[PDB]
């Protein structure tokens, strides 16, 4: 049913948020539940994070605490929740979280610096606060950038301006229309060249 998920305009099966959170709350402690499933769940919650940060950051924190007590710490989880905090426009939360990374012995990932840049951007804060994140990240040996710093920072920001948020007036994420289908309207659809390379394959194949 539509609540649970559906095959959207690209014939892709996207799982509904608030559907995904319930799947989490059933599967929190399951044996098969791996640490990637947690960060995937958190990734599913992001539009809810933007459009109401007050009541959805509590969910993110539930997943956060539960993860941190099921596994001592992980890189995935910190990337995920600093991304969430980036979309929720809590910036000092991002610095706080990063300090928690470094204090924890965790080496902040390339993605963590991209999340720093995102949070630095859409929280309405000036360039040279993002620039600093990029330069520090590249000194750290996280980002490997082949071009000079200026033009490549231009590249990153030009990608993020295309990617403007779920609440914004211009961006990819700001586009809300979804072809709603229970079933993909072409079942022999192709990700490849040949029919061997078809998009939809059996579950015991997957």
């Amino acid at each position: 049913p539509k609540e649970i998920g559906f095959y959207n305009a690209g014939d892709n099966f996207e799982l509904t948020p608030q559907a995904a959170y319930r799947i989490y709350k059933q599967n929190c402690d399951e044996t098969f539940w791996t640490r990637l499933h947690n960060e995937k769940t958190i990734i599913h919650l992001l539009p809810l994070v933007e459009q109401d940060p007050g009541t959805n950051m509590v969910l993110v924190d539930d997943i956060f605490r539960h993860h941190l007590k099921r596994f001592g710490a992980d890189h995935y989880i910190y990337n995920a929740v600093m991304q969430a905090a980036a979309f929720a426009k809590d910036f000092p939360r991002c610095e706080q979280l990063l300090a928690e990374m470094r204090g924890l012995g965790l080496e902040p990932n390339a993605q963590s610096y991209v999340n720093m840049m995102l949070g630095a951007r859409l929280t309405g804060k000036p360039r040279d606060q993002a620039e600093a994140f990029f330069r520090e990240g590249i000194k750290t040996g996280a980002i490997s950038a082949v071009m000079r710093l200026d033009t490549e920072f231009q590249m990153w920001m030009n990608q993020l301006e295309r990617l403007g948020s779920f609440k914004a007036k211009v961006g990819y994420l700001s586009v809300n229309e979804e072809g709603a289908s229970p079933m993909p309207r072409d079942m022999w659809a192709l990700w490849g060249w040949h029919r061997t390379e078809a998009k939809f394959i059996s579950r015991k194949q997957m």
Partner: protein, 56 residues
Amino acid sequence: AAAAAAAAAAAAAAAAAAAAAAAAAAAAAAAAAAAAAAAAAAAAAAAAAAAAAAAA
């Protein structure tokens, strides 16, 4: 939560970190036992340790 690519743990897969006794957790523990126990038992321990030293 339908898609996951490849899981990775903090340690290597199928490889156990073998135990080793560190500096403080041994030394300071020995000092704590020697402190809280007695000076008589400490004297006996000093006697056995000196016996091991003369043996060494």
